[PDB]
Design an enzyme around this catalytic site. Structure first.
Site, PDB file in Angstrom:
ATOM      1  CD  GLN A  50      -3.005   1.197   0.366  1.00  0.00           C
ATOM      2  OE1 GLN A  50      -4.077   0.749   0.761  1.00  0.00           O
ATOM      3  NE2 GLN A  50      -2.821   1.620  -0.882  1.00  0.00           N
ATOM      4  CG  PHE A  51       3.008   2.501  -3.551  1.00  0.00           C
ATOM      5  CD1 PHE A  51       2.750   1.147  -3.726  1.00  0.00           C
ATOM      6  CD2 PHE A  51       4.186   3.033  -4.066  1.00  0.00           C
ATOM      7  CE1 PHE A  51       3.653   0.336  -4.407  1.00  0.00           C
ATOM      8  CE2 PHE A  51       5.093   2.233  -4.746  1.00  0.00           C
ATOM      9  CZ  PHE A  51       4.827   0.883  -4.918  1.00  0.00           C
ATOM     10  CB  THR A  52      -2.172   5.555  -0.289  1.00  0.00           C
ATOM     11  OG1 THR A  52      -2.689   4.361   0.306  1.00  0.00           O
ATOM     12  CG2 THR A  52      -2.490   5.539  -1.780  1.00  0.00           C
TER      13      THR A  52
END
Ligand SMILES: [Zn+2]
Ligand SMILES: [Zn+2]
Ligand SMILES: [Zn+2]
Ligand SMILES: [Zn+2]
Ligand SMILES: [Zn+2]
Ligand SMILES: [Zn+2]
Ligand SMILES: [Zn+2]
Ligand SMILES: [Zn+2]
Lengths: 145, 145
Positions: B78-80
């Site tokens: 999950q980059f966010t």
């Protein structure tokens, strides 16, 4: 105040087996009320959550907010977001809000959402709940004021 | 490195409707790799995730970690999470690692989890994923190293 938001294709909250809140596409907002929060902060957080451009446009780019996407918002109180998780294997809860004031701010946030013409759903403020959801992406953001 | 964890009764990840990973009771771990992260950070975060005492004991008290509760772990990239959400309606990923590095450390983190004899399921890096889960409580914690 903290808003841990997850972009969803659907989300529901069950209390004692019965659905008390349910939405299709939109945002699942886990809300953490902090000791020094007030309506002013709740207002700004609500503003940021509803305006966050994380929904795909008619071409695939994240340029739309939940309102433009026609999405809904399911708000669930989450006291664990305000926890101090800095060190050790056990969270400490002291930065959290008081008993009543916490519910007042929670209800206020929910009402502000509805005032923004958002199809809004909730779960009972402090009830043990099962929150079912499909995080689309996944897309998850930590917003705080 | 960041791990946004949610206590679940079940969770699964699909790519275009196809299951890539699935677990029953345990933890859904959304992993965010930061720019200067390295194996030591991954090792430490893994230790904190697998050791965080957020599962109910016999007296229904939050005192056991996922291993003691006999749970499993589902790790999803999950980059966010490493995004800067200070101002504006658009996220800034200036503190997040690049795709190649994020994948390398995600794979390493997953392997580390497995080495601890933990039933570890996963999503698929960079894939558009739908993460289905039932957050029990709900209980959600942000862990970082
Ligand atoms: Zn019950
Ligand atoms: Zn109320
Ligand atoms: Zn109203
Ligand atoms: Zn299959
Ligand atoms: Zn640096
Ligand atoms: Zn590459
Ligand atoms: Zn890989
Ligand atoms: Zn191995």
């Amino acid at each position: 105040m903290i808003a841990l938001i997850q972009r969803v294709t659907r989300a529901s909250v069950t209390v004692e087996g019965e659905v008390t809140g349910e939405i299709g596409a939109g945002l699942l907002v886990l809300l953490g009320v902090e000791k020094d929060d007030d309506e002013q902060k709740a207002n700004r957080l609500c503003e940021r959550v509803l305006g966050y451009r994380i929904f795909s446009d008619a071409e695939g780019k994240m340029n739309l907010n939940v309102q433009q996407a026609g999405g809904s918002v399911l708000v669930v109180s989450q006291f664990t977001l305000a926890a101090d998780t800095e060190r050790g294997m056990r969270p400490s809860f002291s930065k959290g809000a008081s008993p009543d004031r916490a519910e007042a701010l929670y209800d206020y946030f929910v009402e502000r959402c509805r005032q923004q013409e958002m199809n809004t759903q909730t779960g009972r403020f402090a009830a043990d709940m099962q929150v079912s959801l499909v995080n689309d992406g996944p897309v998850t953001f930590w917003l705080q004021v």
